Each structure stands twice: as structure tokens, then as C-alpha cells.
Design a protein around this nucleic acid. Structure first.
Ligand SMILES: Nc1ccn([C@H]2CC[C@@H](COP(=O)(O)OP(=O)(O)OP(=O)(O)O)O2)c(=O)n1
Ligand SMILES: [Mg+2]
Length: 528
DNA sequence: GACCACGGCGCC
DNA sequence: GGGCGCCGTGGTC
């Protein structure tokens, strides 16, 4: 039943944007649904001034757009989060809708009505889900607001810097491709893997080390190519071209084009329901994968700067995953090396050369790397490799024990979970194909650690944001086990110290949570 | 122009 | 080799 725009309080929104990014979208339509009536706003924008909060599907998004228009409108209940927690594979409105009672259409009114209806069913399904309900009420919902503020804020970028970088890299790529072409004895599209495969394996005589997955073609991966670096002198030239071209096309060239007019900052999206483990995801500008490994990568990182008069504050948990594993495992020995405070790697071993061998087996257990994978990972083949791990599970019995327990529970229950009860169903755990089953197994015992580490971070963000706001500081980015903040120079140290303390004691476990902090005028300098 | 599958690769 | 998202290349509509 259609009723005049002003909806009663507690209504469920329903809006249509001209595009996916709320920071670039136009509010084409806005509607609300309550009880049984449906109210449409004749003027969406002015309408927003009537809502006290965004209640409904993708609330945060409409909330982001409200913020960009100077409206405090906070996001509230959002069935997507409910569905997401019930099943982490619930990632789109299209799917949750079809799966729980509706159709994701393009009408603001039907979307609003869809929101209400969807929330009822989903909420009901959360019956007796004390843990899931806890994650919704105490983490998911409240965090949805932190994210809206994060996206609205944005991060300052050195646009003239990257532009200068572009021309310079362009010339280096040209010298590189010019060189490989002379080595192949002729040019070709070096961006074409198919064309490069023929040059490497077909035309030249380089041994094809591996084949692709879906198409089964001879691969030209960096791995295949790193091994072939000794053969032809073209291999290296190709390897640098790839890096350069990867960095230019992905960061140096598109980023400056994404700056916002009204802000002059990069406004990335922080998707709350796009991962199977419970991790967050950054899209459109994906600011969760900015380079940092190679020199040129670092030159790019320096491009992310703080407002004039502010400082960047980067905080990273220290191997939060190995720690969550110690807690999850309850492995005295592991929980002891952290307690305490001995170099995980160093202490594990109990040299240098070996320390690069005792940290890999400790972290490679997060996916259970194969002995053949380790043989080629280290020096000693699958002979001493399998052994150079026989002590891992021999030193850390409960870990291997835990991995076993989680899996069995996974086969029986049909899903696995995090310290807080976040769950993920891994059906292929009972598959008849070794190949697929052991693949599910790796996703299976990995989820708890990755998901627990995420729950912890999401909770840290939830508690830290308010204090930050009270301090005049801001949360800019999150990169899974780290956060990037922005604070006035006069408060940077006080903000760093606080965030660090908040993050470290977010949720005490058998082992301490260690956080390293850094301040600087740019991301690289803040020591990210 | 918009979008797809795929190989490849950036980060956690 | 666990979790993502983005970029060209080829090829579709
Ligand atoms: N190559 C990697 C790196 C990280 N991770 C996961 C497990 C650890 C978590 C955070 O990664 P980093 O921040 O890179 O490492 P860290 O060990 O947590 O901490 P530090 O910053 O001291 O390296 O993400 C992963 O799966 N694969
Ligand atoms: Mg870290």
C-alpha cells in the first residue's frame, strides 16, 4: 500500500543509485517500507534528511552517500549481514533475495519492501544462534558504520607524483620490451601470454615446466620463469617487464584518475560480505593491495600521503595468525614461544640459513604446503623436507591435533568455525575425489585461523573508532591485520599509543597480541 | 561500449 | 597455496 513519503520511524529503506560506488553514484530513487505500507520520496536527496538511520539492504552504502552529502545518517540493520553470518557465501542482494524470499529488482520501493520482508525471515532464522547473533549485534552491525565513515573520509594521494612516475616507468618498460624483442629476434605482444608461450617454448627451446589449470596451456608464470632464469637471458628481461607493467597499469596510471573532485582523495569501498572466512574486502579502488615489496612498489606506496598538518599512523598485528593458531591449538610449546616472547622462527628451530627454514614450515601450515611444494620451497627434496616438518607436528602435537579435530568436525557438522562462532560450510569435505577433497580440507582448517584473526580485527575497529572520533583522528584503511589512521601532528603519538593498546588487548587469548606502530607523512614512511 | 573466462599477480 | 580484486588478451554480444 503506497503512502506519502514521510514513513513511520523504523522503516526499511530502498534506494537506487546510478552506479555501484555510492561516492560517485546519484541517488535516483529512495523509498521506505514499514508495517505493510510503502512510502516513496518524490525527492530522494532531501528525503534523506528525514531518516534517522539507514535500515535495510546495503544500508552502509546509502549511508556513505549521505555522508558525502553532509548527512550523519548512520547505517543500521541490513539483512545482508544476517544472511552473511548464517552463510558466508551469501554475498549479493540478488542471491540473498532469491534464497530468502524475494527478487532484487531495480525499484526503490520494491527494494524497501524486500528489505523488510527479508529481514523478518533472516532474523527468524537467527533463532538460537547466540554466537551469530553476538557477532551481528556486537561486531557486524556496528562495524558497518565504521566502514561508512572510512569510505567517506578517503585517503590523500600524491597525484602529481604518480604522474611523474608514469612517464619514467614508461621509458623503462620500453627499454625492456625493446630488449626482449631483439632476443626473440622479432616483436610480438609481450602482454599476450599465448604469444609469449610460443616464443619461449615453441620458437625458442625453453623447457616447459608447467601447464595452466583451465586451459592446460604451457604456463609462463613468474615461478616457471624464475626457474628458467638460468636458461635464456630473455627470461629476466621478461620478469622485470611484467613487474613494471603490472605496477604501472594497476596503480600508477589508474589511481590518479580516481581522485574525487569534492575531496581530492581516493575513496575505496569496504565490502562487508564478500569473503568466505569473514575477512573484509576492498573494491573499486582496492586499497588493500598497494605495492610495498619492490623498490618501485615502495615508490608507489609513498604516493599515499596524509593531509597537510596531519600524520599517518600505521599499525600491524604481529603474525596474528600464528598466534591465533597457538590459542586455537592450545599447543603449550607454541603458546609458550609467544608468551616467553622468543623469535617464533628462531625458537622453533631450537644458524641464519635455518631460520629461513623454520619460519616457512610454521607459516606453511596455514595451508598445509606439500612436501613437493616444500622440496622446491627449500633445498633438501621431499626426503628431508617431509622430515624437516616431521618435528613440526612432533614439536607442536596439538596443532596437528587441532587440524585433525577441526576437519572431522567439519565433515560431521558440515561447516567449520572461528573462535566466535563465525561459520563456513565446506561440503567438498566428504568428496570422493582426492584432488577436490584435500582442496576443501585446506579451505576447511584455514578458515578458523583467518576468520578468527578477522573477527579480532573487526572487533578492534569497532572499539577503536569512537575513541578516534573523540580524538579528532580518523581511520582510513584496513589491510586485514593492519590499520592506517590519520591524526593531527599534535596528537599522532597519543593516537598511535591508544590504537596500539586498543588493538593489542581487544580480546585476550592464551598468547599476547603484539602490534607494531609507525608514524609518517606517507604510507611507506609510517612503516606501514 | 559492456562484460566474460583465463592467466597472471598485487596485498594480507 | 589460504583469502581477495584488477589488468590485459581474445572473444562475445
Ligand atoms: N603471504 C602471506 C602473508 C600473510 N598471510 C596471512 C597470515 C598472516 C596475515 C598477515 O600477513 P602479514 O601482515 O603480511 O604478516 P604477519 O606475519 O601477520 O605480520 P608482519 O607484518 O610482522 O609480517 O595474513 C598469508 O596468508 N600469506
Ligand atoms: Mg602484520
Amino acid at each position: 500500500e503506497e503512502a506519502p513519503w514521510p514513513p513511520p520511524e523504523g522503516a526499511f529503506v530502498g534506494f537506487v543509485l546510478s552506479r555501484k560506488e555510492p561516492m560517485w553514484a546519484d541517488l535516483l530513487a529512495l523509498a521506505a517500507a514499514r508495517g505493510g505500507r510503502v512510502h516513496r520520496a518524490p525527492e530522494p536527496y532531501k528525503a534523506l534528511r528525514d531518516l534517522k538511520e539507514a535500515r535495510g539492504l546495503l544500508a552502509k552504502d546509502l549511508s556513505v552517500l549521505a555522508l558525502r552529502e553532509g548527512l550523519g545518517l548512520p547505517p543500521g540493520d541490513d539483512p545482508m549481514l544476517l544472511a552473511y553470518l548464517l552463510d558466508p557465501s551469501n554475498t549479493t542482494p540478488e542471491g540473498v533475495a532469491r534464497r530468502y524470499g524475494g527478487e532484487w529488482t531495480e525499484e526503490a520501493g520494491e527494494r524497501a519492501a524486500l528489505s523488510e520482508r527479508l529481514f523478518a525471515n533472516l532474523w527468524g532464522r537467527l533463532e538460537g544462534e547466540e554466537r551469530l547473533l553476538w557477532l551481528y549485534r556486537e561486531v557486524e552491525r556496528p562495524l558497518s558504520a565504521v566502514l561508512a565513515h572510512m569510505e567517506a573520509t578517503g585517503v590523500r594521494l600524491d597525484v602529481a607524483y604518480l604522474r611523474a612516475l608514469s612517464l619514467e616507468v614508461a621509458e623503462e618498460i620500453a627499454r625492456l620490451e625493446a630488449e626482449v624483442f631483439r632476443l626473440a629476434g622479432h616483436p610480438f605482444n609481450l602482454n599476450s601470454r599465448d604469444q609469449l608461450e610460443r616464443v619461449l617454448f615453441d620458437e625458442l627451446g625453453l623447457p616447459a615446466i608447467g601447464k595452466t589449470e583451465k586451459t592446460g596451456k604451457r604456463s609462463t608464470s613468474a615461478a616457471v620463469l624464475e626457474a628458467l632464469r638460468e636458461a635464456h637471458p630473455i627470461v629476466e628481461k621478461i620478469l622485470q617487464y611484467r613487474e613494471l607493467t603490472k605496477l604501472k597499469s594497476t596503480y600508477i596510471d589508474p589511481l590518479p584518475d580516481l581522485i574525487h573532485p569534492r575531496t581530492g582523495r581516493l575513496h575505496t569501498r569496504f565490502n562487508q560480505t564478500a569473503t568466505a572466512t569473514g575477512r573484509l574486502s576492498s573494491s573499486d579502488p582496492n586499497l588493500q593491495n598497494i605495492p610495498v615489496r619492490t623498490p618501485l612498489g615502495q615508490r608507489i606506496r609513498r604516493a599515499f600521503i596524509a593531509e597537510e598538518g596531519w600524520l599517518l599512523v600505521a599499525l600491524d598485528y604481529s603474525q596474528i595468525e600464528l598466534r591465533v593458531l597457538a590459542h586455537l591449538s592450545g599447543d603449550e610449546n607454541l603458546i609458550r614461544v609467544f608468551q616467553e616472547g622468543r623469535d617464533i622462527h628462531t625458537e622453533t628451530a631450537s644458524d641464519p640459513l635455518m631460520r629461513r627454514a623454520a619460519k616457512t614450515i610454521n607459516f606453511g601450515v596455514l595451508y598445509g604446503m606439500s612436501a613437493h611444494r616444500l622440496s622446491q620451497e627449500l633445498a633438501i627434496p621431499y626426503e628431508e623436507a617431509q622430515a624437516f616438518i616431521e618435528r613440526y607436528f612432533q614439536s607442536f602435537p596439538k596443532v596437528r591435533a587441532w587440524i585433525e579435530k577441526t576437519l572431522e568436525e567439519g565433515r560431521r557438522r558440515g561447516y567449520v568455525e572461528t573462535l566466535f562462532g563465525r561459520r563456513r560450510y565446506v561440503p567438498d569435505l566428504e568428496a570422493r575425489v582426492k584432488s577436490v577433497r584435500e582442496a576443501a580440507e585446506r579451505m576447511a582448517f584455514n578458515m578458523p585461523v583467518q576468520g578468527t584473526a578477522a573477527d579480532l580485527m573487526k572487533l578492534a575497529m569497532v572499539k577503536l573508532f569512537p575513541r578516534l572520533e573523540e580524538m579528532g583522528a580518523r581511520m582510513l584503511l584496513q589491510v586485514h591485520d593492519e590499520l592506517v589512521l590519520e591524526a593531527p601532528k599534535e596528537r599522532a603519538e597519543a593516537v598511535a599509543r591508544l590504537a596500539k593498546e586498543v588493538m593489542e588487548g581487544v580480546y585476550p587469548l592464551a598468547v599476547p597480541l603484539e602490534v607494531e606502530v609507525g608514524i609518517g607523512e606517507d604510507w611507506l614512511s609510517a612503516k606501514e
